[PDB]
Structures are given as C-alpha cells and as structure tokens.
Design a protein around this ligand. Structure first.
Ligand SMILES: CC(=O)N[C@@H]1[C@@H](O)[C@H](O[C@@H]2O[C@H](CO)[C@H](O)[C@H](O[C@]3(C(=O)O)C[C@H](O)[C@@H](NC(C)=O)[C@H]([C@H](O)[C@H](O)CO)O3)[C@H]2O)[C@@H](CO)O[C@H]1O
Ligand SMILES: [Ca+2]
Ligand SMILES: [Ca+2]
Ligand SMILES: [Ca+2]
Ligand SMILES: [Ca+2]
Ligand SMILES: [Ca+2]
Ligand SMILES: [Ca+2]
Ligand SMILES: [Ca+2]
Lengths: 193, 201
C-alpha cells in the first residue's frame, strides 16, 4: 500500500529574459512508478502567471515516473516585454510552488521554484565589429555611420534582428533591444582615424 | 592654297554642366581645327591656375594627325567629383565655377579662352524620396526599435534610386531623416510614414 507522495526536483537557475521564450523541466518521481498530476501555485494560491504553460503529456500512466525515468514536465513561457524590473535584482523574480500526487492520492508538500527575470541586455553581449576607418573621429559622415552599423550587425547575428543599432557623431554605438534595454559599444572598439 | 595654318582650333563647350557633391560627373569638349590636328588644351581661370584639383581629363589622342576634323572632332572627356563638403552659400546659384578653355593646333595657333561653367549642388536637390509603405505601430509618439527598423527598411525599399551611403534615421514619432553622403537632407513627416495599428486594424 502506497502512503508516500512523489518527490520533485526543480531547476536551480531558471533565468528568463523579457520578451524571449524560456523553457525548463520539472522532474517528478514516485515510489509507485506513477505520478497522476501536478499543480503549480503561489504557495497553494493561484499561480498568477498567465504567460507560463506546462505540458501534461504522459500524466497518470503506469511507469511514467520511475527513479530511472522520471516524469519530465516541460514548462515554457515568455516574461512580458514590459515586465518592470525592481531596482534590487533579488526581487526581480517570481517565487512559486509545485506539488504532485500519485495514483493513491498521496500529495507532496509545496516545493519552491523561482523564475528570475531580467532585461534583454543582461543576456546580450555584443561582439566586436570589424573596425571602420573614418575621416574625423569627432564627426562621422553618414556613410561612415552606415558602415559602423553594418559592421556591428554582421558581427552580431545573435542579437535580435528587431534590436536597433544607432551610431553617434563620434562612433559610439547604442544597441536598443526590443524591451528598450541597451548596450553601448565604446567608440574605440568601433572606429579608427 | 594658303602656305601656312594661321587659324586656331575651335572649341564647343557644354552648355549646362551640373554636378552633385560627392558624385562623379563628366562632360565633353568638342574641338576641331582647319588642319585636322589639335595638339593640346588648357583649362584655366582666365589664364590663371584652374584651382580645381578634382577636375581631370584624358589626353588620349592628343596631337595625332586627323584627331580633330569637322566630321570627327576631338572629344575631350572631363570628369571628377565635387568634394562632399564643397561650400554652398546662402544663394545656391553662387555654387558654380566659371573657368576657361583654349586649345593649340600643331602649327602654334592657340584659340582665345572661352568660358564654361561648372554648377554644383547638394545631393538632396538630385534626390526626391518616395513615401514608404506605411508602417503600423503601437504608439505613434514612441516607436519601438523594431518599428524604427521597419520604417527605415520601408523608406529604403521605396527609394532604390537614393544612394546606399545615405543614412536613414527615424525619430521617436516616426519622422524620417534621409541624410545624403554630403550631409544635405530630405525629411518625410511622420504622418506619411507611420499609422496607429489599432486605429487601422
Ligand atoms: C576679363 C577677364 O579675364 N576677367 C576675369 C574675370 O571676369 C574673372 O571673374 C570671374 O568672372 C566670371 C564670369 O566670366 C564669374 O563671374 C566669376 O564668378 C564666380 C564664377 O562663376 O566662377 C561666381 C561664383 O559664385 C563663385 N563660386 C563660389 C563657390 O563662390 C566663383 C568663385 O569665386 C571662383 O570662380 C572660384 O575661383 O566665381 C568671376 O569671379 C576673374 C577670375 O574669376 O578673372 C578675371 O581676369
Ligand atoms: Ca507514492
Ligand atoms: Ca517515461
Ligand atoms: Ca548587455
Ligand atoms: Ca549577463
Ligand atoms: Ca539603420
Ligand atoms: Ca589651325
Ligand atoms: Ca531632395
């Protein structure tokens, strides 16, 4: 007779960037080999994360949750592009809980997991462009600005196509990501006389 | 038959030479001589130095018999690029250089200097941007980075004739600036560039 609830392993470093789909897995095991269902909540209260979704593939099937082959629950979602980021990054997160139960109805305690979220510039780190030679380092021409932007773009296919690259009069590059966070490339990585 | 050539060459000048800063241009002088041969030319400022180091011409076929007949005149190709930064005064018509040309035949006769005028203008005078296909945006007063990219691409697509070296910028409200290589500009007002997505869907 099964009187023992499932056990749940959560990922330690769920880090999501605004506006960009994330995914992670829960792993659930039960001594019976079978997990019936799970529930995501805020310590038992409503989850309150309508942009998060998880798959219920293979729920409630014998053998779906053994020590060797745990039930691997795919969770995905997109933190809103305009999600405010608190000044203290330790509060830029969502703390939530998961519980799970077996076919006998033994329910686990609430297990904590944390979704940290960050501005897109915390993900992206622009690579060096090929240097653009300019006539005046203090007053780039329109052609030179075009060349700088093209070189930054060619070096950074990994940056969203939707980010906008601007170039100031002295060759300083600003990259503005879709979520309005930014990176800067100092002119000395960009232009030479 | 007169014993000697005493008649200098005759030069025809182009009447409407118009150059845009930063863009190569060319024009032709046509020269004939009663002997059929023109030895060389001089471009000057009424006999003083030309003072236009960006003006060039080929001496191909100079001083060859038969190079300068009525049926087959000497065609002198003059070409160059007015500097990107050449100053254009408040009166755009003052943006011109009046210079002189003369030519020698092979008998020592040199024509008297005649004038020609190189007018030069800003590039925005040459280029007239077509309006882009409308970009639909969420906030007319604050375009997103992808909306500014989209506007720029639309302006670029609607204007293949504009130079690739022109830089297209987009303001917060979708006002477009096209800055040509010589830093002259054209503007497209926001109401011809962007429209609110919700109002229009
Ligand atoms: C008799 C004789 O040989 N005298 C010439 C004298 O005529 C000449 O003065 C120039 O004359 C021409 C007309 O034939 C023009 O009026 C010149 O003015 C301009 C020009 O068209 O070249 C006006 C123009 O606005 C100016 N451009 C700019 C950008 O400012 C130019 C410019 O000052 C010079 O051409 C660049 O050197 O001038 C007028 O000056 C003079 C020399 O030009 O030579 C005498 O012997
Ligand atoms: Ca159990
Ligand atoms: Ca399995
Ligand atoms: Ca960054
Ligand atoms: Ca980082
Ligand atoms: Ca651009
Ligand atoms: Ca002659
Ligand atoms: Ca124009």
């Amino acid at each position: 007779t099964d009187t023992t609830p499932p056990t749940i392993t959560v990922p330690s470093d769920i880090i999501a960037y605004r506006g960009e789909e994330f995914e992670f897995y829960f792993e659930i095991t039960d001594d019976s080999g079978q997990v019936k269902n799970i529930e995501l909540s805020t310590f038992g209260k409503p989850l309150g994360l309508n942009w998060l979704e998880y798959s219920e593939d293979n729920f409630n099937v014998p053998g779906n949750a053994t020590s060797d082959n745990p039930l691997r629950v795919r969770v995905h979602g997109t933190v809103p592009l305009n999600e405010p980021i608190p000044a203290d990054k330790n509060r830029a997160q969502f703390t939530r809980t998961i519980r799970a139960w077996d076919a006998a109805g033994n329910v686990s305690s609430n297990i904590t997991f944390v979704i940290k979220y960050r501005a897109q510039t915390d993900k992206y780190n622009p690579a060096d462009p090929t240097i653009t030679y300019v006539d005046r380092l203090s007053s780039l021409s329109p052609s030179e600005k075009n060349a700088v932007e093209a070189a930054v773009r060619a070096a950074n296919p990994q940056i969203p196509a939707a980010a906008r690259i601007t170039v100031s009069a002295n060759g300083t590059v600003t990259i503005t990501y879709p979520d309005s966070s930014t990176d800067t490339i100092t002119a000395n990585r960009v232009v030479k006389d």
